[PDB]
């Protein structure tokens, strides 16, 4: 109830939400099966300060792409025309069911790169991914909006 409200509210408007903020709401959130999160997705970054996140704001990064469970691609960026295209130079990526703080869910595995997305439900159209990429201190936390 509160979790997925109070976050669809942060994520619909674009607003920025610190990271133990977001965690203390996420840790509420229902897992998602795999194929919930097939099709096209626009993402959004909770913590617009973090040095990934200026360099995906700098990239122009859309969202991504569920194809099925074997093939993802995880960095849709516009390009200067405003048509979406496929950035395939960290690799492409797949989904698998992974745990995070004993909840499973349908996790975003890259290829290439050691980083993990745990996504959990916050509606049919809305999911908080939690990024698990080694050495990180911490875990760190973006959204994306199903296209329909």
Same mark, same amino acid.
Request: hydrophobic share 30%; proline share 3%.
């Given at each position: 109830m509160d979790a997925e409200q109070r976050l669809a509210k942060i994520i619909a408007s674009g607003d920025?939400? &610190? /990271? %133990?903020? *977001?965690?203390?709401?996420? #840790? /509420?959130? %229902?897992? *998602?099966p795999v194929d919930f999160m097939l099709g096209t997705w /626009?993402?959004?970054?909770? &913590? /617009?300060? #973090? %040095?990934? %996140?200026?360099m995906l704001l700098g990239m122009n990064w859309?969202?991504?792409r569920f194809i099925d469970r074997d093939h993802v691609e995880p960095l849709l960026c516009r390009s200067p025309d405003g048509s979406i295209y496929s950035y395939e130079k960290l690799g492409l990526a797949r989904l698998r069911e992974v745990a995070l703080r004993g909840t499973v869910s349908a996790a975003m595995i890259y290829d290439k790169q050691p980083i993990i997305d745990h996504f959990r439900r916050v509606n049919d159209d809305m999911v908080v991914g939690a990024m698990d990429a080694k050495g990180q201190p911490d875990i760190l936390y973006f959204h994306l909006t199903?296209?329909?």
């Open positions: 920025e939400c &610190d /990271r %133990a903020t *977001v965690e203390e709401l996420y #840790d /509420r959130l %229902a897992p *998602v /626009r993402g959004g970054i909770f &913590d /617009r300060g #973090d %040095a990934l %996140a200026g859309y969202g991504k199903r296209e329909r």
